Design a protein around this ligand. Structure first.
Ligand SMILES: CCc1cc(C)[nH]c(=O)c1CN1CCc2c(Cl)cc(OC3CCN(C(=O)[C@@H](C)O)CC3)c(Cl)c2C1=O
Ligand SMILES: [Zn+2]
Ligand SMILES: [Zn+2]
Ligand SMILES: [Zn+2]
Ligand SMILES: [Zn+2]
Ligand SMILES: [Zn+2]
Ligand SMILES: [Zn+2]
Ligand SMILES: [Zn+2]
Lengths: 127, 355, 465
């Protein structure tokens, strides 16, 4: 029994919309561009490393992984979803460096490295 | 050059913040201008021998409203002129001077509106600039908010002025955060949002129109002025802007040879081409204007001096009058550049005829 | 060979020449651009004038409470009626803000002419006869601030390439990995993360072409002597080829003190904080938080996580539900709402008190989680600086997180920023330790109905001395 407004525009909700203001999505687009932009600001980081980092961050932000136990699955899902971009943009070795760094951080198993690399190679065969 | 041919005084005795000549007026029709100050909107018609004929006047029902800006458009179908006004309350009003009524209104800005501008090619696209730190692009046909230009890389303080370029491909905004920001509206994202705003019909749907939230400008600088930027106008692909440092700076994003349409958002460079000097304009909210042909430039100061520059310098006249000593808030040139109007802090209007 | 006074004079003379040249050169580029720009003004201004010629827009006429216009230049006084614009209701004041789902950390002669001048001085040095030191000493004499005669010789004489690029060099394992090692946040699995300022300690990241060679040096660090697996991954080398190459309240911060236990000198122990999964101490560290062995709930003093004012850790709390069903928000464990972002739907409307307010869409039970109070993470000093501006506006949307940080919802935040203050609230704020981060949870103080306005007592969040 009161006029409600959208938090993003301050425009009123019609009774048709029936109390639904959901421009409160998990990954706000601006964070996606803020990350992309920040990685590019680095002088000491090469264009190869930068693109892998940007793609990984965009993936982690989309799925909202919060546990270390989700890291093995996250790498596998990274290949399925971003594999085409990795191959096409020629970042296959830089991705390999990301996987070993993740293993160094104790987030992924040794088999995850193999499985992810094996999956990316057969994805390249489809091309 | 110019002769002061008439001076008018509005009864409210409050500052007149805006003047705009109607540039949509037919060839042969009398030259009409609007005036905004207090909670009033006044319309005038220019005649020979300095005669200014008082045509229409409107008053907001709210005594606490204070109009700061106005802009003229036309209805594509009806061929009627329309005048948008807004001020301190953050409400946009679309007046129809043919019907003598408020035909539309937009509430949505979280603060005062300092500038209103209509797209040079699409009469339905209205840009509002607010004290809330954001710019808003509205579609006045479908009553939709196309985009919000603000956020993480938007203005950090009150937006004071904005201007479309000649073909409506990009906007340049400025404000109290000392920043001048470029927002491209010919991008695939923006062109689709404009298209989608036209397709929007709230009667054929239960879901609201999705406004674009443009958090990132296409270029940003703070290295032109040392204080607040209160007026910005494109001069072709160059930019004309001022602060309280008694100069209009002519400049461009990037290096000298850098093309405006090739400037990356991360561009850290600016090129100052030159500046137009004057004095006693160190007070906030003082606007410069140009004629349609972008050959003339005008700016009034805090003591009633009116400066006119010939921009075709690939010259400065100081228009003065004994009875004019108040702060000139804004100026307006007729489409043909024959008439120049100045409005003041004392509800006065000054007509300067070109001869 | 010319003397020092002479050279200083030449420096001046040449620099003055280069400067007046650049000046007059640039003055011309400026005139060229204005001219080239004027044509664009002409072209586009004709397009617009042509479009205007195709339009016949109706002229405005006289109108028919009244208003008058007077003239200081003795034109006659004019009087017309004053048409009233019907009242439009305004909305409360609101400034620009960016939506957030998690907190966002925020921290508190040129080289072109110099080279030209040297070269011009070298041309005078050359012409003198019938890289010289007697030139560097003269530039340093005329520009002491720019540097010394040695520093200018160094200045005048004037990253790691990608393994996927054509310039791919043969380098050390750490050179290859450096960018990944220093930019990666182990705590939130992102590169140059928006939450954690300090870089990860070196112990955290430990447990034939330029590109083939560098990859070998990297892969031997992981697959120590399994040359079968090193060959498989290199792809362009074999089990034998690889083998042959070999023969040739304080904020938490992970502790890392090799060969020292977590005792009285441990930063975690000093800060009176538990060691977390991110700490580089022993697995048997007596200061580590163990987690809970709960079957479900974790919403009572019976749960060690809940009792310690901590949410459940998904890598330690393996039986309650905190570790499973990542697709769901309604999980067996009722102590992982903040980390999962299981917030309630909230609605924006003018408050029944003042300004804007926030209203709950559906009912909530006593002690049930509503939303996290998100914002920018700023230092105490930044909050003191920011507060000076805020007081001018009579607005105060910053809240103490711990001794070191304040969360400020002014610039960035979530819908719960609109919950007004009340000394008689229906909500309360609880700072919790959520996977090594202090986060503010907003909980119902009593059961709440559909459409009820939300209010919490701001003073409790401000009161930290
Ligand atoms: C959290 C928002 C909120 C919450 C509740 C419960 N209720 C509400 O009504 C609102 C809305 N609200 C109230 C009025 C307001 C003022 Cl008066 C000043 C503000 O912010 C200054 C703006 C200049 N500042 C600057 O820093 C510029 C000058 O650079 C400092 C912060 C803001 Cl952020 C707001 C604002 O949005
Ligand atoms: Zn982090
Ligand atoms: Zn320790
Ligand atoms: Zn520790
Ligand atoms: Zn420990
Ligand atoms: Zn438990
Ligand atoms: Zn637990
Ligand atoms: Zn639990």
């Amino acid at each position: 029994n009161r006029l409600y407004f959208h938090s993003d525009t301050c425009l009123p909700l019609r009774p048709q919309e029936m109390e639904v203001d959901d421009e409160d999505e998990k990954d706000p687009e601006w964070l996606r561009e803020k990350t992309i932009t920040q990685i590019e600001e680095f002088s000491d980081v090469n264009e190869g490393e930068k693109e892998v980092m940007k793609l990984w961050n965009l993936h982690v932000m989309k799925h909202g992984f919060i546990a270390d136990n989700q890291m093995n699955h996250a790498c596998m899902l990274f290949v399925e979803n971003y594999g085409q971009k990795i191959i096409k943009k020629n970042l296959c070795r830089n991705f390999m460096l990301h996987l070993v760094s993740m293993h160094d951080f104790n987030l992924i198993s040794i088999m995850s490295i193999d499985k992810a690399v094996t999956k990316l190679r057969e994805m390249q065969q489809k091309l | 050059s110019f002769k002061c041919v008439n001076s008018l005084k509005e009864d409210h005795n409050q500052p007149l913040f805006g003047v705009q000549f109607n540039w949509h007026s037919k060839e042969g029709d009398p030259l009409v201008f609007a005036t905004v100050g207090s909670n009033r909107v006044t319309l005038y018609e220019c005649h020979s021998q300095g005669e200014i004929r008082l045509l229409q006047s409107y008053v907001d029902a709210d005594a606490d409203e204070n109009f700061y800006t106005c802009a003229w458009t036309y209805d594509s179908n009806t061929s009627h002129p329309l005048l948008a006004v807004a001020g301190s309350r953050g409400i946009i009003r679309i007046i129809n001077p043919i019907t003598m009524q408020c035909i539309k209104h937009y509430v949505g800005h979280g603060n005062a509106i300092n500038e209103l501008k209509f797209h040079p090619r699409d009469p339905n696209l209205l840009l509002s600039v607010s004290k809330d730190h954001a710019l808003r692009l509205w579609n006045i046909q479908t009553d939709t908010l196309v985009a919000i230009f603000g956020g993480v890389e938007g203005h950090r303080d009150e937006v004071l002025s904005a201007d479309y370029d000649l073909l409506g491909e990009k906007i340049m905004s400025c404000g109290m955060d000392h920043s001048l920001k470029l927002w491209r509206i010919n991008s695939k994202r923006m062109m689709n949002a404009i298209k989608e705003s036209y397709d929007y019909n709230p009667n054929k749907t239960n879901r609201p129109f999705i406004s674009q939230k443009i958090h990132f400008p296409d270029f940003s600088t703070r290295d032109i002025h040392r204080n607040y930027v209160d007026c910005v106008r494109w001069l072709g692909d160059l930019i004309l802007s001022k602060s309280c440092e008694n100069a209009i700076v002519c400049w461009k994003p990037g290096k000298m040879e850098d093309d405006i349409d090739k400037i990356k958002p991360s561009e850290s460079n600016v090129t100052i081409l030159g500046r137009f000097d004057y004095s006693q304009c160190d007070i906030w909210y003082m606007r410069f204007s140009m004629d349609f042909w972008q050959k003339m430039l005008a700016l009034g100061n805090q003591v009633g001096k009116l400066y006119v520059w010939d921009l075709e310098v690939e010259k400065c006249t100081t228009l003065t009058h004994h009875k004019c000593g108040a702060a000139i808030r804004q100026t307006s040139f007729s489409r043909d550049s024959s008439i120049l109007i100045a409005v003041c802090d004392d509800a006065s209007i000054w007509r300067w005829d070109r001869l | 060979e010319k003397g020092p006074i002479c050279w200083r004079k030449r420096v001046k003379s040449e620099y003055m020449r280069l400067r007046q040249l650049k000046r007059f050169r640039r003055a011309d580029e400026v005139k060229s651009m204005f001219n080239s720009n004027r044509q664009k003004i002409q072209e586009r201004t004709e397009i617009l004038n042509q479009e205007w010629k195709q339009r016949r827009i109706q002229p405005v006429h006289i109108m028919t409470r009244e208003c008058s216009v007077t003239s200081d230049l003795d034109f006659p006084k004019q009087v017309i009626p004053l048409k009233t614009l019907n009242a439009v209701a305004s909305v409360p004041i609101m400034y620009s803000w960016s939506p957030l789902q998690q907190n966002f950390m925020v921290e508190d002669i040129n080289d072109e002419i110099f080279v030209e001048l040297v070269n011009a001085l070298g041309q005078l040095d050359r012409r003198d006869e019938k890289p010289s030191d007697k030139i560097f000493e003269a530039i340093s004499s005329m520009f002491p601030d720019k540097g010394t005669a040695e520093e200018l010789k160094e200045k005048y004489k004037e990253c790691t390439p990608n393994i996927d690029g054509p310039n791919a060099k043969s380098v050390q394992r750490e050179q290859s990995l450096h960018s990944f090692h220093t930019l990666f946040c182990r705590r939130c699995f992102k590169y140059d993360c928006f939450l954690h300022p300090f870089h990860a300690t070196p112990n955290t990241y430990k447990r034939w072409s330029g590109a083939e060679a560098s990859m070998f040096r990297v892969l031997i660090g992981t697959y120590y002597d399994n040359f079968c697996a090193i060959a498989r991954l290199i792809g362009t080398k074999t089990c034998r080829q690889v083998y042959e190459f070999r023969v040739k309240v304080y904020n938490y911060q992970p502790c890392d003190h090799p060969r020292q236990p977590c005792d009285n000198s441990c930063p975690c122990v000093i800060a009176q904080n538990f060691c977390e999964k991110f700490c580089q101490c022993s697995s048997e560290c007596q200061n580590r938080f163990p987690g809970c062995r709960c079957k479900a709930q974790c919403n009572t003093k019976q749960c060690p996580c809940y009792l310690a004012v901590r949410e459940c850790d998904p890598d330690l709390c393996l039986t309650c539900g905190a570790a499973d069903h990542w697709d769901s928000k309604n999980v067996s464990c009722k102590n992982c709402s903040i980390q999962r972002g299981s917030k309630k739907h909230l609605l924006l409307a003018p408050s029944d008190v003042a300004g804007w307010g926030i209203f709950i869409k559906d009912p909530v039970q006593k002690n049930e989680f509503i939303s996290e109070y998100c914002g920018e993470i700023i230092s105490q000093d930044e909050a003191d600086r920011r507060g000076k501006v805020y007081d001018k506006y009579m607005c105060s949307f910053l809240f103490n997180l711990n001794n070191d940080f304040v969360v400020d919802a002014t610039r960035k935040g979530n819908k719960i920023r609109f919950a007004n203050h009340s000394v008689n609230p229906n909500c309360y704020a609880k700072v919790m330790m959520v996977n090594g981060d202090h986060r503010i949870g907003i909980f119902a103080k009593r059961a709440i109905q559909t459409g009820e306005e939300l209010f919490f007592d701001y003073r409790y969040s401000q009161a930290d001395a």
